[model samples]
Target chain A: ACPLDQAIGLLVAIFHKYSGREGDKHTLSKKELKELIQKELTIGSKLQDAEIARLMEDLDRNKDQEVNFQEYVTFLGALALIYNEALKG
Target chain B: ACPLDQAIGLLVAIFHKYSGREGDKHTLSKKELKELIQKELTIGSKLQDAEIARLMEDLDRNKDQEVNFQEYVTFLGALALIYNEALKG
Candidate 1:
């Protein structure tokens, strides 16, 4: 299997793994998103709770107060950019 | 290391691995991009040459005739969506 291809899968799967825990089962509520962030990403802990609150606001692009797959992908895309810049440096 | 975090690293690393093989070392020329797609992605070989040509054109957002890291990440973001939908199905 293509690890890179599977990398995409892992990103998606991790979202659902947390998203399915409550509410929509397809989107991440603020609480669900918070736990996913705290557990799954290294940068998760680096941010303060207030910033995390602001992030939830930013990530909720539709004003839906939740992170859907579309919004989630956007967040990941931004993350890829951040990580890539650091890697290239 | 976090496998998922490392997964992000793999994606960035793979791009540079191919990107450094030719011109610019930091961007993907049409040829370097083609080689990258053909080897690293499952859908690569399935795409006809004409479609691949079109994709390269579509991906060159700045019309610089090259795919920079930003454009490359956009491609991956779209790929993540496509795969996520497929996974949910």
Candidate 2:
């Protein structure tokens, strides 16, 4: 696959790696989100539990209490915006 | 870098590769958008000029006639949704 598509695929794959670990099997429970963040992101390493809880609260836009694919993509899109600023700086 | 971050970085890098080619240096002009899509996406290979024009219309949410980082990230997020479905199939 092309690099852009590959990057997109990686995003999807990463989400599934965490989301499929337990309950729901297609969405991220709080624990799964924490693990995914701590393992897959640099900033995540420094985030506190409370911060993650707030993040989950923010991302769970539908109030499902779980992070679904659409919610997960929104998170990634926000991350991309941060990365873009860092890249330009 | 971790794979997820690396993938995010790749998205940022790809945008700059085209966005920096001309006018604005931080946003994709119509030509830049066309080039980025055709070069980086499988679906892009089959897209007609008219299709690309329509896509640019859909993605340029700010009506600025240029695709900025935020707009680009939205495009990538949409692509991630499509890729996620394909992966599950």
Candidate 3:
């Protein structure tokens, strides 16, 4: 339970910690999103500027919480592919 | 840096540990998923069995690999919502 809960907080916390640095307290801005990926994820180095730019194009141009939790869930799903394959290799 | 990397492995390992118990070596079966929720999450009781049932109907019955991991991500997203709501409550 500790690791599970800790993992959740770390994921969510990693997002919000950067998300709050400038534009949004509840959600992530594009810059915040970039910083988060580059800082927190295994695929960070491979996620080049063009990729982030393309993703930001698909993201909401609405409020601070634009990229909410569900979307990040998908993001993590993709990262799962990256991580597991990397680990297996 | 160490904590973040450790957290990632912790999550991947947690799933891998339980996922290897019964069905596919790389994925969690429904029972395995259920057991994981009960043992690992705060939202275990809060999650409806109907929930997993609905998800199962849509899964690839032949291959548990994709759906289990994907659904588990959904489960993680579910926890994020659950924990944040609990915090505000």
Candidate 4:
């Protein structure tokens, strides 16, 4: 499968697992979803506020100061694609 | 150095080297530049159109369907940030 496809698939899986719903776009609150993602991606329980801010900046395309599902999925796909390319090289 | 800082530095280096000018953002064309970035990030000499499309979709903020240096840099920073966090764990 394409790396991006696999990556998006993984993101969808993570979203579903955390949100406990499928294709129920209205079921998940964006803010709570973003927080869940941040928690999952953090280094540890001791993750700094600065680090969280940096990540939000990196993933938040709209600069809305928060990451929606689309933004988070974009972030995941980009990283997975790059890692996949690096592995190939 | 901070992972995000290092990643941004590396991206600056790459942009300068490939763009062939310093602080001359006008020196590079977005279309030509996106092609260059795609080439560098591709798998081997032959990259699939689908893969490239997927990558641009993931990296191209503003939904412009193309990536500028800022967007590309953000993509790099995000990946580096994640890798750094993973290293800590």
Candidate 5:
């Protein structure tokens, strides 16, 4: 449980770290976000291919094969909700 | 990394989607699993609490409070070995 939480937390932090911010706005260009995702995936210790596909599918909610900021946030939100519910139960 | 391999795969899939199942069950019903455990704590954005704690103090082998499921396939094999040892005793 801790490991999973740590992983998602790390991914989001890394994304924010690399993805520039302005006041209340945060943005990561498509190219930059993809690069960061790939880099993290490479260094990450326990992620599997199926999991990656799931994430891409969630983040690419539009099924456009590309992830934008909104999509990324939506994915993060979904992750959080699951975590929260798991904790509650 | 695929959202921490789907959030520690979704905290191992919401602790096995509610700590109930058979033929290789999973569990998570202790201290709420921490997220990030460092920063960016939010409603559902992330998690944080204490800096650290002794695993020994928190993880109890004797008490059922810890866990009882076959967390992983390897643990399943271990259980058989332990069971055999108990029979020998």
Candidate 6:
């Protein structure tokens, strides 16, 4: 597969890898989200609890206290936006 | 780097790979967008001209006749949505 396809697959796979570790199986609970961020993202290591809390609030669109696939994809888009800006600098 | 970080970097690099090939060097011209899709995405191989035109129309958020990085990120999110649904099936 192409890199773009692989990236999409990786995104989906990574989400499931963490989300499946706990409740709902398909959605990410706060604990799962924290682990996924801290483990999978470089910037995550520097993030404070308040930031993660804000991120959960930003990503959890359904108010269900869990991040679903749609919400995670939106987060990916936000990440891409930041990466795009960094690349331009 | 972690897979997720690499994935994000890949996405940024892939956009520039094509976007830099044409006018603007930052935004995707219609031709650049077409080539990027046809070359980097398996689904692009089967997309007809009409589909490509419609896609351009959909992605050109500012109506500037080209897709900026922000718009492309949005497209990536939409693609992830499709991939996520397929993964669940």
List per-candidate RMSD values in Å: 4.6, 4.7, 5.3, 11.4, 15.9, 4.6
Candidate 3: segments with Cα more than 4 A from true spot: A22-24, A42-65, A84-89, B42-66, B84-89
Best of the candidates, lDDT: 2
Please provide, for model 1 over B1-89, each residue's C-alpha lDDT reduced to its tens digit, 9 standing for 90 to 100.
57568667777777788777767766776556655766777875535555445665554543446777755666766555544444454
Q: What DockQ results do all the predictions give, each relative to the true complex?
A: 0.49, 0.56, 0.41, 0.05, 0.08, 0.53
Candidate 3 chain A worst ten-residue window by lDDT: A56-65
What residue pairs are clashing in model 3? none
Docking class of 1: acceptable
Model 3 agreement with the true structure over A8-42: per-residue lDDT tens digits = 76677676676566654656655456556656755
* Candidate 6 RMSD to the correct structure: 4.6
| lDDT tens readout by residue for model 6, B1-89 | 78988777777788889888767766886556656766787875434545444664554443436877766766766555543345544
Regions of candidate 2 where Cα sits further than 4 Å from its true position? A44-64, A83-85, B44-64, B83-85
* Residue pairs with clashing backbones, model 6: none
Clashes of 4: 0
Query: How would you encode candidate 4's per-residue C-alpha lDDT over A1-89 as one tens digit per residue?
Result: 33322332344455445445434442344544555555554334333455445554454443334443455445543432232222122
- How should the candidates be ordered by DockQ, best one leading? 2, 6, 1, 3, 5, 4
For residues A1-89, what per-residue lDDT tens digits would candidate 1 score against the true structure?
A: 68677777777778778777877666876556656665777775535555444665554453436777766665655555644445444
What candidate 6 gets wrong by more than 4 Å, as runs, is: A23-26, A44-64, A83-88, B23-25, B29-31, B44-64, B83-88
Error of 3 at B28 (Å): 1.7
Look at candidate 1 and tell me the lDDT of residue A70: 66
For model 6 chain B, where is the 10-residue window of minimal lDDT?
B44-53
DockQ of 5: 0.08
lDDT of 3 by residue, B1-89 (tens): 44445556667777887877775666676556656755776664554556544443434343343435656776667556645443232
Ranking by lDDT: 2, 6, 1, 3, 4, 5
Supply candidate 6's per-residue lDDT for B76.
68
DockQ metric, candidate 1: 0.49
